[model samples]
Target chain A: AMVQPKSQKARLFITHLLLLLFIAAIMFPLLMVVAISLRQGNFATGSLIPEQISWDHWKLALGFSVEQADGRITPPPFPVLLWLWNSVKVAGISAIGIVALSTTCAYAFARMRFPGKATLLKGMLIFQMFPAVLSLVALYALFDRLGEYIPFIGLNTHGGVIFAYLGGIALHVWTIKGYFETIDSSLEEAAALDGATPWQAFRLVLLPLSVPILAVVFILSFIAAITEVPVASLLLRDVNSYTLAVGMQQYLNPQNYLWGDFAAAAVMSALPITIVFLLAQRWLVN
Target chain B: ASVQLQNVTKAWGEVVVSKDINLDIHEGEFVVFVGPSGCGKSTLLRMIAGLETITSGDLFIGEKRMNDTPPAERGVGMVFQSYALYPHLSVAENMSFGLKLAGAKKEVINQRVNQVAEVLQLAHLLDRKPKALSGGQRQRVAIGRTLVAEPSVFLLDEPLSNLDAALRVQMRIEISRLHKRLGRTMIYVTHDQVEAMTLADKIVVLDAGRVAQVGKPLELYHYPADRFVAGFIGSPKMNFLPVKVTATAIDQVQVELPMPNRQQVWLPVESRDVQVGANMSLGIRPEHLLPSDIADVILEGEVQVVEQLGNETQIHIQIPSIRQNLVYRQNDVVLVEEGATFAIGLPPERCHLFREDGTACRRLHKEPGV
Candidate 1:
């Protein structure tokens, strides 16, 4: 029914080629890490493929015992599974907290009119402008002062790190507020005429319609909390309480670097995030 | 239930929209509020529905004072111009939403939804969402959604305005039939005079947030209260020709029409207050004008445009002395050229006289045949 033009065909082919090259560029380092995890030594060789493959790196990264020079076996002092669990707990809680806070605040800013609305929105924009690293010194002092009043969420605790991650909500509120403005206000008015209270309208109508934006905000908050290193490293002094990002850095010690084990742990840590992203990918694009 | 508004006024700060409006709408009556845009017809409807607060006055429904009542407790269902159907819900769900909010049992809700769907002829499309419906279907669903609530009064704000001409006609008949079947008080707001004439038992013509005139459709068509109503209530609006009062009597006034040729016309007006040589306007409808021999006052004009509608023919005539073209409608199939000269008449009893202030002079005639 149709004829194809030569110029259009060439353009489509060039676009596909560009996309393939981009994917290969990002995947090359991940391939290198996988190759290093299969090798036996701690040092990386120039070859793309390993000369010999072994399971010792994977076994040790999973908390299995390794043989020592004196013919005795010893387990790793810091278990990667514990650190992974801590990261998951902190990230999950922070994601829920951030989503709850951002959705309500975004709804209020988008729909309601009250005094000081513009000034508060502008204040939030200015608050997000400063980088998180710049607030590290101030946060440490604040956490020390808070330790005297609230011991559970004080320094050297997972709550402290999760509390610090909530500061990312400033930008998320703005993003979701922009999205809420796109929905028609008449829908809410209709709901009100149907005898729904304000809370019921928000819970039943507005929230269900905003699932796509909420999924995006949740995923971003989760990933940021799990992978944040500076705040976690500064606040958490206990080895047991170290998150995956903080604990992973311990393998880079100059005395005896565990490059192969570190690569194995890095490859394994990506599974949960990959699975979560795959589950939410449908709503993310919408 | 009958609805009443006593001295209702709506204002925002120093700006006033409606000023001291009063109206009484009886039960089972079909009333329409017709006006141009920004005339506050919709605002008045919203006030009666309790969507807009009454700035000052008393609103009564069935003798119950309702100024402080919320919209939900007002026992009124409203159909908006935009339909306002829930995009995420199916037709059935949208119709049943209000019943569910009122905590109606599942079987009762289902029965009500089925009854309304059957009445609206939407039983086949109950599972379909609003986006899958046509304009007429969506309009039916909107009315059906309100009907299922079983409110005492219905408020519709230009509900058929969004449809095409053919669909609008179909829905207009559907709405008229629905009103008769329901036998509930309905207050409809639209700017379309045809809809007002066809469906309303009583038409309330609004202009500039004030009630210009309120009467039966035929009554307004025959005897308008003022110049605005005379111009607004008919198709191919009434024509106005400048005249001077030549003589005044207790039951009639003689005016001289100063057009193409000077002619004197007698208007059966019950007023002696009109002074001689005072400027006035004579209003005549297009259909009332006939050939010179069978009519009272005659004027000569050249035909400018001819429109033939198979059943009736309309001629736009240009008189040399008048600034605006005059329109004449003939009932029979007639053929006329654009440049042909003709003499048309304005009957003495059919003519209307308006004072310089845009108010009509009281007509002394008993009644005009429809």
Candidate 2:
């Protein structure tokens, strides 16, 4: 009934050009960061590839010795490995907590009928409207008070950070519930007719079909926890426990500005999340 | 294995779709509940299948009261009109779902799934998803799902309504074959009388949420219990004539025709219910009435419309004597103009008499009337 108007050769040519442009846009920044981080000189500019490369920034960031010709020595204050380990602990726990809490709450809100359904759902929507900035002081004070009685959930522990990341769970629950509503209820009915309990249907049928949205939720939660600056700046006072975002702030002070090292660290910090986004983009589009 | 519904009623917040229903379905019989849209046929079927709980009723499925039993626990398997298959699962997984849920042994589940797949000729499609199947194939998979469960009773809710016309015919034959193969109590619901006629051994016609009639398909077609059933059963519908009985006798009765030129004919009767000039309706199928050359009890009319099928021609004749046209069929060549007078004959033995209240007159059922 229809015909494509364009020639195949022309269409292929245009597609090739578009693909090249997309790849260039994606890889340019990472290539620049890698080049600048490897540059031998103090200044990094005007080169796609570094002429000479060294691991000076890496050694200093790791808190190892950097030799000087005049016998004076300065070492990095914060250990990069500790900061990386702290970031992983915070993000990992936060992702798991989000998934577990959101899935249960979402399944209930989606499939069950009970009292206070409308009220609870409206409250969830209302919470998303308020900016996260308003909750900072209250959350900081609350965690500080709880830290005395709660074993590992004290103000400076990874548990405290993980609990803070759970603030976004209500929003995630609302989104996942909305997604689940669009799926056919007959599948659930068929499962019930097949003698499966409601829980079994939710676990085996609904959850597997919901993998794409769940993965998106996990990625968003992980990214938010990793890049969280305001809450971390307000609560986590220990310098050794600084997340990558807050620690990067230290290098920007004008009096002790380590611009080259700061740029290198910032560039390195963005790599893992960039890779994650690239991997999850397909799920987001679908 | 007779299923009975005693004083059954269903209501959706006072809508009262089905009210005070009483019916029975005999075992190893293909029974169809037919009605127009929103006539509660599907609701009744679901109620029988235990998918829906009746608001108030005593339902017996093979001597077991199924009021509180869940659908899967009620020993009944239902085929949905939508053929609602799990899209993520393979055909084998979909078919074996109920058995797996009942915790059947793995070997039994495998054997049942394979056997159903072979019977439905879906063996090659066992590994494919529902979305990958055609409409008929998907329906067969749905039926296969029910078969693997091996329930004592089978309920189908408009199972062929979703297929194309040709596939509907094909699946109709297959379902009849399936009914014979299973030899279980099968109850089906459909709005189409043609499907009901071809597939059901007994058809229950529902109208406005009430049972119009229940009988064998031909019995309903030939001897409808009421005007609604008479109108609902046959293709092209039954025709009616307004008449008044003037003279009553044991063997025959003289009736005055609605038109002046058409003389009254004597029909066999036993009831003295016909008084002098009592108004009633005369019923006849379109195929039974024909264009006449004998000119006895002949009414003149103009041909209003003509429908030509390959086997027979249906012509609607507009009579100046009545408000509407009368539909009749001409098997042989009958050439007449649209405005020209055409005479049609009524065979008294094949006709029916109904009072003004839509109840059939019992006199038409006596031996002499036949």
Candidate 3:
């Protein structure tokens, strides 16, 4: 029995209405956050759109000058630019490192055979089952102990945080390995027959064919490193070395809640991630 | 370059795929390995191409031991059954891939690729990716890819199996012409006997991972070494009727066929170890059985089915004595209805005798006319 056009239209109309409602529900809070950021004071209001709008919070969040009581302009007490730079540095490096390590490891797991291959694969699956928060205590202690020998990657440094971010590779390796397994190994075999060595085959054939998965892993790791709050907060003790997530957390306290400045900082923190996604969008879509 | 396999054997644990396989392929000759599925034809071809390791043997190509050499260094180009054309590449790029890898000049690669494309009638499709081309076009590109490499020997593993019937015949002719033009030693593997018969300079018949027989197509057709080769080499397949040996002479054997009337037929076979009253099989091709008047031995049966091809007529006759349907082929159309009684002839000279072990007894002399 075929459905009538009238009923089909009505069903489609209902589906679209529900979809619009869902989108509005999500967008409402985001728009409210933007309105709060654009307001004058560092406090939440009862209205969704504030009556007065100003750029004072934006200026302070972006490391611009703020007028003081003495009629002089000065930089904010905490450097937003330093925190932004630190966030980009750690996230970018960790993303690149994770993509590289995962792709190579995934390739080895997909193609080669050794005594412990199955066991290692199973172990990686088990490792990914546990959340990173579960290992935070051990990682903090490990970094603190390693500081005696290697100060650069210690408890309160970006290297230590980046090292912790690399732990996400277990999940990425599984994802990339699944993608690698779907590719016909025959192409690599064909490359070998065409006089390409194993390394050349991997670089020329396998790597180019796997750009989509690599880009996905890169973006995922980058976002995870940037947005991770618990680990960044515990590891980042100095204000100068803080990532944006930890730096923005300082506005929250019992006595004072800098809602406007925090919202402005949150909006500013999303720009780098958006830019990276735009840059790698071609691979992701293809 | 000539290829020689010296006692090559392939085994996995206790099960052997091919054992003690030995053959010599001459340079510039088209050799085809034909067999049923799981007969190790593809495995043998892969071993020669260096894609598979030889379990325990020495493989020689142009006087060099190729046991440890890589496939690229073996100086052989191969076309797979699936065509295996790189999907991401255009036809021209696929053809010139090996040349580009070898660091050949751009002009040389272009010239070679174009030459092969022209020969394969694929010049018009060179810029098209494999997925965009039709099956026949993709097959031509696969052939062109191997030809552009200009290796010493060419290896093909059932390259025409993926095409439709019409395209398969077309590609078979193209491959044959390519061999004539290139004059390179070619090793082709297929289970299709028609391809083996039409294209091969020598056909190697394998059964259960063992080389049953290897000879010229006509030689195998006329003088099959065993019952397996006799049945496999023919198109309609040779018919076998069980017989009992009545007497054995120096150069001939007398066997009794339990047909409608017990008929005695003498076959000129040279076998001395045949005991009297031993069970044997009398082999005769479908075309050899004629009408009763002209036959030396007569057989009566009821026609089960009649197939009239334009060029030939095939009649399936069910003989009560043998309890099997015997196919009789004739050049011209024979009007016969199913369930009609028919008497067919079996010429004495055309009959072959196979011992109980499925080995054909050697024919003593060639037929007088041919």
Candidate 4:
């Protein structure tokens, strides 16, 4: 029924080898951090294999006490779990906010016609061209000024963190607008003739069809809000309010560096993101 | 419910699409709008359904003016060419979507959806999505989606155009049956003359965004009002030959045919607003052309191409006297060779006369069984 040659077999083997090499290359740094977290002390190790394994760093990261050989008990020294919870809360709210805000804007841009609509879309595309560092600095000043009038949405608040995260919706709006253009307008017209208001048609018919794209925007927004350091570091005043990405810096100072604790925290922070990816992978991969 | 468009006109800024479109569609009537491409048949249908707004003039469904009424509130339902079924929805859910939107009770929605699903033979397919269904099944589902809503009028925009040939005929019959069972007013738009002729009780022939003629199918078949309708309403289409009016009378007009010896023929049509020596077109259908031995006037032509079906034969002929090729259709195979001269018979009473302005000189003869 079929024919195959030696060279074709060799080619498939070569392709598999290339993919294996690519996966190992990216996983190397993550494996190294795991290896460092299990090492004896706050020092770098030469090989990936740990010479002496200890769970003191992980015990501390999990908010438990550890004992030394001299029988001295050391309690957990960091607020790691609190910061982890804070990061998750901000990221979840921001992801939902991004989807809700951008989808309505994308639908309007895709379906309705209004004056200055073309210019407004062009303006959004042009504004993203400016350097983002300048925008963050402007945001810092904006939060400073708005914090006086509105305390809840100001600095040191998770609301402030999510509010900053939603400003990145322009790219998602463009992404979802491209997708909506592929669907026929007649579907909406049919829904209208079937006795649906425009709002009902959009909410029931259009939104359900857009699940895959919504999942993508959600995962991206969640990851960005969780991993963002510069904005969160500048705005958050207390160590308890800091996101995990910003709070992890306390383990590293100029005079005394706790490399073991840093690696342990870094390995744990990757856990939430992995779970988010795994949960949303069904829609994204579809 | 009766739908009426009184002096309806649709325009986009300065460019007009449908102009002065006045129509009266009675209850339980099957009307098909037939036209060529860019003929605005679909636009006219959309305007009547309240999907497209009328730039000027009034539309009435029963006693109410529906000019500003929303499409849903106008008591109309439309089946689009694409079927427009929601891909994420199952057949049952798709049919129930409109009823659910209207806040129908759960039991009422289920009952209506199940009733329509049975009628369309989609009860077995209630759990499947649209992509899992065949073309004809999807078509029935599209129609069923509208039927559940129970609108007073149904508008279909070439619902069968996307199906294969055999499937189209099957769906066409299904739609005709559905209309008979439901007895709702239906307005269908199609570019196919065959679909227009077979399914329609009343046919509205449109040309260039204007109504060329409106009549019963056989009324349009026997007596067309213009050159466009005469050319559009038949298979192998009516052939046009240039002629000059030799004499004009109140009851009949005499014209000289374009042949070798310039044979003259008399056609029984109104000769109003006529002048002698005026240029006109004489129209004749291929089926009306008989064998030379059986007819009065005969013209000789060489056969160009022959298409022979087991039941009927179509022969393309090249007349030596004129540049245009004429087609002759006969009931059975005529056994004619290409490039061979044959006498083609034409009856004068079956002829049509059109002035230069594309208006037909109304035929005075009675249509058979009219």
Q: Best by DockQ, which number? A: 4
Docking class of 1: acceptable
lDDT of 3 by residue, A1-286 (tens): 8767775888889899999999999988887778777776765545656767788778887888776476578566467788888888989999998997898899988866577997998898888888788777887889999987899899898798888887768988988888887776557667777898878877777787788888888887887788889888888898688988788777776666666677667777766667776665555543
Worst 10 contiguous positions by lDDT, candidate 4 chain A: A277-286
Evaluated on CA atoms against the true complex, candidate 4 attains a DockQ of: 0.65
lDDT string, candidate 3, B1-370, tens digits: 9998889899977999997988988889899999998789978988888878778989999989999999999988888877767766788998888988758789898899888887678888888878898877777887788888888988888878777888778768777877887788999998889899899989999999988898888888878888999999877989988888999887899998756566787888875888898888888999878788996676788998899997999999888776778889999788998899998988877778888888888777684422
What's the CA error at residue B94 for candidate 3, in Å?
3.7
List, residue by residue over B1-370, the lDDT tens digit for candidate 1.
8998899999988888998888888989899999998898979988887777888999999889999998888888888887878777889999888988757789998899999898678999999989899987898888898888999999899998889988788778878888887899999999889999999999999988888888899988878888999998787889888888988776899998776466777788866667788899889899988777787666678988899999889999887666668889999788998899977877888888988888898777778553
lDDT of 4 at A230: 80
Off by over 4 Å in 3: A1-86, A112-120, A130-132, A244-286, B82-93, B101-107, B121-133, B256-263, B365-370
Show what share of the native A-B interface contacts model 2 retains.
0.50
iRMSD values, candidates in order = 1.5, 1.5, 1.6, 1.1
Across A42-133, the per-residue lDDT of candidate 2 in tens digits comes to 56355646777777676676567685577557676456667766788888889989988898889879877778887998898888788677
Going through the candidates in order, the fraction of native interface contacts each one reproduces equals: 0.44, 0.50, 0.47, 0.91
Tell me which of candidates 3 and 4 scores higher on DockQ.
Answer: 4
Per-residue CA lDDT of model 4 for B208-243, tens digit only, reads: 889999989999988899999999888888989898
Q: How close is candidate 3 to the true structure, as a TM-score?
A: 0.83
In the order shown, the candidates' Cα RMSDs to the true structure are 4.5, 5.3, 4.6, 4.0
Off by over 4 Å in 1: A1-85, A110-134, A174-184, A191-194, A204-213, A227-230, A244-286, B86-93, B123-135, B242-247, B253-264, B270-272, B275-280
**Which tens-of-lDDT digit does each residue in B1-370 have in candidate 2?**
6788898999988799998888877878788899888887978987877667689979898887889888767777788877768877899988888877656789998898888888789998889988889887888898898898888778788888778988777767887788787787888888888999998888889988888888888788767777888888788888988888878787667777777654688765544666677788888888888557653567677877667675777788887776667898767555556666777887776777777788875445444222
Clash pairs (backbone) in predicted model 1: none
**Relative to the unseen true structure, what is the Cα RMSD of model 2?**
5.3
**Which numbered prediction scores highest in TM-score against the true structure?**
4
